[PDB]
Structures are given as C-alpha cells and as structure tokens.
Paper text:
HD-PTP is a non-receptor type protein tyrosine phosphatase (PTP) that contains five domains (Bro1, V, central proline-rich, PTP and second proline-rich domain). Considerable evidence has also indicated that HD-PTP and Myopic, the homologue of HD-PTP in Drosophila melanogaster, are involved in the morphogenesis of MVBs and in the endosomal sorting of cargo proteins, including integrin, Wntless and Wingless, and EGFR, and that the Bro1 domain is necessary for these processes. Thus far, two ESCRT components have been found to interact with the Bro1 domain of HD-PTP: the ESCRT-0 protein signal-transducing adaptor molecule 2 (STAM2) and the ESCRT-III protein charged multivesicular body protein 4B (CHMP4B). A recent report indicated that HD-PTP is the central regulator of EGFR sorting that functions to coordinate the transfer of EGFR from STAM2-containing ESCRT-0 to CHMP4B-containing ESCRT-III.
Herein, we identified that the residues 350–370 of STAM2 are necessary and sufficient for directly binding the Bro1 domain of HD-PTP, and determined the structure of the complex to a resolution of 2.0 Å. Therefore, with the expectation of altering crystal packing and promoting crystallization in a STAM2-bound form, we prepared a mutant HD-PTP(1–361) protein in which Asn33 and Tyr34 are substituted for alanine (referred to as HD-PTP(1–361;NAYA)). This mutant protein binds STAM2(350–370) as potently as the wild-type protein; this was confirmed using ITC. After incubation at a molar ratio of 1:5 between HD-PTP(1–361;NAYA) and the STAM2(350–370) peptide overnight, we crystallized the protein sample and obtained novel crystals with the space group P21 containing two HD-PTP molecules in the asymmetric unit. In the HD-PTP(1–361;NAYA)−STAM2(350–370) complex structure, the STAM2 peptide forms an amphipathic α-helix that binds to HD-PTP, mainly through hydrophobic interaction. In detail, the intermolecular hydrophobic interactions involve Val354, Leu358, Tyr361, Leu364 and Val365 of STAM2 and Leu189, Leu202, Ile206, Ala336, Leu338 and the hydrocarbon portions of Lys141, Lys192, and Arg198 of HD-PTP. Specifically, Tyr361 of STAM2 is located at the center of the hydrophobic cluster, suggesting that this residue plays a key role in the complex formation. Alanine substitution of this residue completely abrogated the binding interaction between the two proteins, as confirmed by ITC measurements. Along with the hydrophobic interactions, we note that hydrogen bonds mediated by three water molecules also reinforce the intermolecular binding between HD-PTP and STAM2. Intriguingly, we found that the STAM2 residues 351–353 play a key role in determining the binding partner of the protein; in the superposed models, this region brings about steric hindrance with the side chains of Lys151 of Alix and Arg145 of Brox, but not with that of the corresponding residue Thr145 of HD-PTP.
Author numbering:
A (entry chain A): 1 to 33, 38 to 361
B (entry chain C): 351 to 367
Write the structure that this text describes.
C-alpha cells in the first residue's frame, strides 16, 4: 500500500586516506627537461585535502569527482603508475580490517577516491524519508550513481588493491545499490498508482537484486571478511527478500481481482501472507522502522486475504490453483550502474597542469 | 535535473507502455 512506512536503507562508510606525496616526484620529473609546476601542485594538494576530508553532502560528490579527474590529468603527464619512474607510495586503510595498505601506483589513489564517491552516494540516497515522489526519485538516482561508481571501479581497476575493493565485494555493493534503487521505484510505482501487474514486476525485480546481494553475503569467505557487517546487512536483505516477494504476490492478487479471477486471487493473497509472515520471523530484533512497515503490510494483506477467501467460499466457489500452475512474475529491471566518466570536463574543469610553454 | 531524468527513463518507458 502507498502509505506503508518505509524500510531503512544500507549505506557504506568512506575509506580513510593515508599519504600520497606526489609533489617531490612530480617536481623531480619535470626538472628533467624551471620552477616545476609549483603553484599547480599546491592547487592539487588542496584538492586532495578537500577530497580526503570530504563534506558528507551532494557538493562533496563534486569535490571527489573533480579530484578524480585531476588525478587522471596528472597520470597522463607524469608517470606515477606501477613500475613507473615517478611513482610514489599511496596509502589507504582497508575498511574491513583497518589495515593500512600501500601501493606505489596513482591508480590506487584513483580507485579509493572512486570508492568513496560510491560510498557517499550510498549515504545521500539513504537520508530522505522517501514519502515524497522527488525523495524517491533522488534516492533512486543516488543508489544508481553508487552502483555506477563501484561497477566502474570493478571493471577499470582490476588489480584489486585491497580486499574491500575485490570483484566479489564490489559486485555485492553494486547489486545492493541496484536493489535499493529498484526499491525506491517500487515505492514510486505505488505512489503513482500504476497497474497492479507492473507493481508486481517491479517488486519482483527488487527481490532478484536482493537475492544476488544475499548470495554474496552467504559466501563464507566473503562473510568472514566482512564480519559483523555481513551479519548486519544480511538481516535486512534477507528480510526484504520475503517482504518484497509478499508485495509482489499482493499485487498479482490485485490483478486477479481486476480480472475477476477469484480463485487465483485467493492463491496469490495466501502466498503473500505466508511470505510476509516469514519476513516478520526474520525481522525479529530489527528496528521499529522495519517492524512498522511489516505491521502495516500485515494489516493490508491480512484483510485482503480474509475478504478474498470469504467471497470465494460463499459466492464464487472457484478452485484455488497451485502457484506452480500460474505464469510466474518476470522482474522488470529499471535501474543500472549509471556511467562514470573520470575525465568529464563538466565535473573536472580545466587540466590543472595545462602548460602552454 | 538531468541525472534524475536519466535515472528515471526505464521506469517511465515501462509505465507509458
């Protein structure tokens, strides 16, 4: 129902930065050809400082993107990659273990900045209460942007500099973000009062994304890596899998009601009620926010089941079909990792190291 | 909002048949 209290969302912490002393290496490199990019390096230093201590807001995303871009410009003028002559140590903290990990590679710095871009977007997406349509739309967009950052990171930084940025972990992050993005669209679909069948397809897709997320969290090696984060994330995700399965079948039941298929209607409502109860069991101990959403949905599905079974038992007398005989709901993918372009002039601005003569 | 617009494209295509 459109008025259902909203589920909480998961967001990711930003990684903590160590040193990246690029200045002495850059100066030494350019002196190999007068006062060696001195003002230009000062600007970049300020940009890094702003980025590594980024304000946790929307403008902060711009800060991260601009620094990321200037890092690419520097990379192209001064060889600071792995094995290259002007490479210096880059140090960041691995977020799961708290270990300092160092690499003499400017791409490692780029990677961590891109990671924090994704993490910050995950934060911004999770802040609105999502009762407003725009709140849902903007939250959805942020989650797709977060997915976009992690996906770009996974594909274009394959070295996997630390365990928190491995392919498995980044894919988990992507699928979690896409799931939360699609969930925002489910909320919107109900606020917009779309066709019940469409709401079902959208909710079914939420389940699919969350299944893939839960899948990764159930990997024992991944689970031991994350520790209690895995336990914390999995509680919500697994609960949501049965919750949105219930929501899907609630609306397939509504479609049945619209099509005057009253046997089918009871079958779907019963399935939704069974699935919701399983979510409630799984939600034991979780915050009142989760409990309030489940309570609300229990009222809706419980009332509609009763009425549907009542009407069928007294009036329509239609056979209640097994679900396996019915056409299963196909998830509708409406979200994606939104493209990141590190060298987008719109976000980076002029190459800091532009040198006419 | 250009970003939000792109992010909502698939949704709107779906609901507008």
């Amino acid at each position: 129902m459109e008025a259902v209290p909203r589920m909480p969302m998961i967001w990711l912490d930003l990684k903590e930065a160590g040193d990246f002393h690029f200045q002495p290496a850059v100066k030494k490199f350019v002196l190999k050809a007068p006062e060696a990019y001195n003002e230009e390096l000062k600007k970049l230093e300020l940009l890094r400082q702003n980025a590594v201590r980024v304000p946790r807001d929307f403008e902060g995303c711009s800060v991260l993107r601009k620094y990321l871009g200037q890092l690419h410009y520097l990379q192209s003028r001064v060889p600071m990659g792995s094995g290259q002559e002007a490479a210096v140590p880059v140090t960041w903290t691995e977020i799961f273990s708290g270990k300092s990990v160092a690499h003499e590679d400017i791409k490692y710095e780029q990677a961590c900045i891109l990671y924090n871009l994704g993490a910050l977007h995950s934060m911004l997406g999770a802040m609105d209460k999502r009762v407003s349509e725009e709140g849902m739309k903007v939250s959805c967009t942020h989650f797709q942007c977060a997915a976009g950052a992690f996906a770009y990171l996974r594909e274009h930084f394959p070295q996997a500099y630390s365990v928190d940025m491995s392919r498995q972990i980044l894919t988990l992050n992507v699928n979690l973000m896409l799931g939360q993005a699609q969930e925002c669209l489910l909320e919107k679909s109900m606020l917009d009062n779309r066709k019940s069948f469409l709401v079902a397809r959208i909710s079914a897709q939420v389940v699919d994304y969350y299944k893939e997320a839960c899948r990764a969290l159930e990997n024992p090696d991944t689970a031991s890596l994350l520790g209690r984060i895995q336990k914390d994330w999995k509680k919500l995700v697994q609960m949501k899998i049965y919750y949105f399965a219930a929501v899907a079948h609630l609306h397939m039941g509504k479609q049945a009601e619209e099509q005057q298929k009253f046997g089918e209607r009871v079958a779907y409502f019963q399935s939704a009620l069974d699935k919701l109860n399983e979510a409630i069991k799984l939600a034991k101990g979780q915050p009142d926010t989760v409990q309030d959403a489940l309570r609300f949905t229990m009222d809706v599905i419980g009332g509609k089941y009763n009425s549907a079974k009542k009407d069928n038992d007294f009036i329509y007398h239609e056979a209640v079909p097994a679900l396996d005989t019915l056409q299963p709901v196909k998830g509708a993918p409406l979200v994606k990792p939104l493209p990141v372009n590190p060298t987008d002039p719109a976000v980076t601005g002029p190459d800091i190291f532009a040198k006419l003569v | 909002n250009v970003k939000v617009l792109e992010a909502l494209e698939l949704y709107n295509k779906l609901v507008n048949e």
